[PDB]
Amino acid sequence: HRPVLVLSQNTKRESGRKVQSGNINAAKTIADIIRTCLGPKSMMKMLLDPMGGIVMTNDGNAILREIQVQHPAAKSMIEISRTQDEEVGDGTTSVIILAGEMLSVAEHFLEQQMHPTVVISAYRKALDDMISTLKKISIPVDISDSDMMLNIINSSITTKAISRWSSLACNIALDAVKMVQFEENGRKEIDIKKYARVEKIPGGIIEDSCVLRGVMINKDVTHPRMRRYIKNPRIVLLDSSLEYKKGESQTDIEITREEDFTRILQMEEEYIQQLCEDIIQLKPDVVITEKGISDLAQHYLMRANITAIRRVRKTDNNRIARACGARIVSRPEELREDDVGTGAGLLEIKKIGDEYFTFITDCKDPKACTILLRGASKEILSEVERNLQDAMQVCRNVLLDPQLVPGGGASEMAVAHALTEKSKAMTGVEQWPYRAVAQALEVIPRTLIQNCGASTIRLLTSLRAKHTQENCETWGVNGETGTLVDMKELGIWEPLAVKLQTYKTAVETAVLLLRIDDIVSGHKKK
């Protein structure tokens, strides 16, 4: 068999209008998947994963993470929603619909024999004017006010499934961020992924779920003689083990006499008594380590009335170090009085459904908390956990940038009239793709009325006429009823960092996918 002399074996080549108009249809397809998951009248979407679980959610990020596509331009839109989920909390879905619409109007100009670099240069001029328009229609927020911050987080959870328990989820998500607001040196940081642990337990009701003033772990006591109820403990956190293990050497003992073997087994007992005597000089109450505790170490802590927890995780030890104010030491003979976590409140080993849980709550000033979620099953508790992650990150953006944009369609139409009046001074070939950016922003109030069943012709004509005058300019779409209510009366306000990241990611996605005119698939790597 003589082989055929070819070049670039087993690959494909595609260019021309089949790739420029081919990436638009791949982006319009993902925009139709999550189109019914934007407004407050959205519905859940049950997903199936190859691990065997079930994901029933309506958030735009959790839907696209379970979709495996084969198109290369469709893989780019999934990474856009992952970028919006890591920057802000409730800024993902809105980007995929907006990037699908800015590419929808970009496909019209590609049929008009216009170069893609001309539409992108008109998109960058429109991107720089959408940022300047949102800063003019913003409003400063008093972050010290408690009731003002409850209205911001309620605007982000009205879309999600926790809108029924709005009086509870707003107080949990606000108090979780204000506890983890830590500042040691001259830098303010909010860590809601390492310190704001969301522990869910199947059982009970959702109304009994509350944010604890402290941490909790699913660990029982090491010995039943140890106390399960301490009022004011002195928690000492350890990192090393309390056992006798093999050293990091080639140690080998030559036993010649009879008394040598019994001496080694006694020196192993005396070594445990040496480190157990070093940790009781500070008179603790709770000893918590990350490694194993031998039975000889439990014997000295039993008669000293010390409650010992055995195998707490490394991520849970860093969280309890901020709640109780302790320092994680890795040496029992180098313990100091500043390494003891005083100020911890009631410690109780409760049981929730045939399983013990160590509760360290009622702290004086904790820097880390644990949201205790209780529900019907593990299916809906993963929904409230994903919704509280989108409810705590939208409170983090206000504490870092206290500016609010009128959402619910009022934000998208206030800039759509600003780009229309600014396009009259263009007088060039980039004027017509500049006008299509303002028409592409209108798809966000278009989706709020298509989900509630309102009219799309009779409402868009009246809403576009409201933004002609410069007086009110904050009229949006009421997703609950279906009429036009001003956003100063409803209370729907979105933060600036959510609206800025939505517009900056939707334009630059259209910048990337419009410069693609060729696709080569079929090559291997190392």
């Binding site: 397809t29 859940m44 979407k45 029924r164 009970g204 073997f261 000889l296 299916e379």
Partner: protein, 525 residues
């Protein structure tokens, strides 16, 4: 479809399609589990791939061991798992409410209406049903004759009422001798042992403990009276050093001096035990029993047999907590502070062998606060009937003690709750008028199923029950013998308050979420 464009091997369901998937699967689990609700239900024989018989009719064991591969059937199985984890009973009635909340809502969504409007009426009906449950609960100050009638209801729905009279005296009397003075009752203090001795109707309540292992030496005493329990966690067997050392000897006579030296640290632990038997005035019988969680080498078992000390080995983790309360001693991890204060006491310690399987019994304790229900079922599947009924009955009497109020029985709660929603149905003042009607008809399946499983008419029984409730003020219910409306608070049929509270909360949220699902799809391959 859009999902078929990007991923061609990804099936999908649309808005009117995914609703018919979840509703038809909810009726599939409803029609199976409705034939075993109550005392007049039918037994189910569950055979796995190995060939073992699992004869039971509990709603949690039925949904787990069933050959079903459906996403909607897996959602109800997750809610049914948490029902049998925190409160025991209420699992079979949990699935029938979900199966009726989607069937009664199917008659309105298909007739033009939107699924979200039905969910607005479910929340307005759940708030009134939760306030009505707090008015019909009866507080009886946790009397021991009240706990008999609570345990009799949960045990009769899992056995043929001949063992229910036996297991009631084994569940109520076991839950009272654990904790007093308004203390939370730990269910880990009750051990569940499976025997095969006599018959299924011979399950007694051992006031002490029953261990599944016996003495590992033939010269030890089989029956020990007035014994001292020494609970140990030390290792009496030969253990090597952590640093690998190895012996080095020159002559053959020096080799035997090292075997005597390597057991000297082991024999020092045995000398601490045999001196404790002499320091308790050993001029009498003075039996000694060591449970000894860690294993014992046969060199130390031969040493303890010559002194008259019964020594067990390889116990459980929770045996150092149940026997510590029962004997009254101190579970020690070392022999550095041995004293007679850490010793236990039991009037009778004896063993019994059932086919090369010894069982050590510890009985005759003063205040044990830890007991053992000794199930003696003849078959393997009959052991699973009593074990699934004991843990159902123990969690039933635990909720009647922690909560101070007892909820009425079969039809005295669900019929009165549905009639309370009709008078508050024009109070919603909007489009959610039909949502309260769908929630009220879904709660009436509990008198409908119990009248159907008893062989009576379904519609003729519900007319006479609602007539006796509306023409009076008494919470009347269903009778499983005659079909006449009988009050449940007077005939001795009770239920738990937390079961009916969680049935109104777990079934409502899982119904408002399923009705708002329209994109059932399978992607990720």
């Amino acid at each position: 479809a859009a999902v078929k464009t990007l991923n061609p091997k990804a099936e999908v369901a649309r808005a009117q399609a995914a609703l018919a998937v979840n509703i038809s699967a909810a009726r599939g689990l409803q029609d199976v589990l409705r034939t075993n609700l109550g005392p007049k239900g039918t037994m189910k024989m569950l055979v796995s791939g190995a060939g073992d018989i699992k004869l039971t009719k509990d709603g949690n064991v039925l949904l787990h061991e069933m050959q079903i591969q459906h996403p909607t059937a897996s959602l109800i199985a997750k809610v049914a798992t948490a029902q049998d984890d925190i409160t025991g009973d209420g699992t079979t009635s949990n699935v029938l409410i979900i199966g009726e909340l989607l069937k009664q809502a199917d008659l309105y969504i298909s007739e033009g209406l939107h699924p979200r409007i039905i969910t607005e009426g479910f929340e307005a009906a759940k708030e009134k049903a939760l306030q009505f449950l707090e008015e019909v609960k009866v507080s009886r100050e946790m009397d021991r004759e009240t706990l008999i009638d609570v345990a009799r209801t949960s045990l009769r729905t899992k056995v043929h009422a001949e063992l229910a009279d036996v297991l009631t005296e084994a569940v109520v009397d076991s839950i009272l001798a654990i904790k007093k003075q308004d203390e939370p009752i730990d269910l880990f203090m009750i051990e569940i042992m499976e025997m095969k001795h006599k018959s299924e109707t011979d399950t007694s309540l051992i006031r002490g403990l029953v261990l599944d292992h016996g003495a590992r030496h033939p010269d030890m005493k089989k029956r020990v009276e007035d014994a001292y329990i020494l609970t140990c966690n030390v290792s009496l067997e030969y253990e090597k050093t952590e640093v690998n050392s190895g012996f080095f000897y020159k002559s053959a006579e020096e080799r035997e001096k090292l075997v005597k030296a390597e057991r000297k640290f082991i024999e020092d632990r045995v000398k601490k035990i045999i001196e404790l038997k002499r320091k308790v005035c050993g001029d009498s019988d003075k039996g000694f029993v060591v449970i000894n969680q860690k294993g014992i080498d046969p060199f130390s078992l031969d040493a303890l047999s010559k002194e008259g000390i019964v020594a067990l080995r390889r116990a459980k983790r929770r045996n150092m907590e149940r026997l510590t309360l029962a004997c009254g001693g101190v579970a020690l991890n070392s022999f550095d502070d041995l004293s007679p204060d850490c010793l236990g006491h039991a009037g009778l310690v004896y063993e019994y062998t059932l086919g090369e399987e010894k069982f050590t019994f510890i009985e005759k304790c003063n205040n044990p606060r830890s007991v053992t229900l000794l199930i003696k079922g003849p078959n393997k599947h009959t052991l699973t009937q009593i074990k699934d009924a004991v843990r159902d009955g123990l969690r039933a009497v635990k909720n009647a003690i922690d909560d101070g109020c007892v909820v009425p029985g079969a039809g005295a709660v669900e019929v009165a709750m549905a009639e309370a929603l009709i008078k508050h149905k024009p109070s919603v003042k909007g489009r959610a008028q039909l949502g309260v009607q769908a929630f009220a008809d879904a709660l009436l399946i509990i008198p409908k199923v119990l009248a159907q499983n008893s062989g009576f008419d379904l519609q003729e029984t519900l007319v006479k029950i609602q007539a006796e409730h509306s023409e009076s003020g008494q919470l009347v219910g269903v009778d499983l013998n005659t079909g006449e409306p009988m009050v449940a608070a007077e005939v001795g049929v009770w239920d738990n308050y937390c079961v009916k509270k969680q049935l109104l909360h777990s079934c409502t949220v899982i119904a408002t979420n399923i009705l708002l699902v329209d994109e059932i799809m399978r992607a990720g391959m």
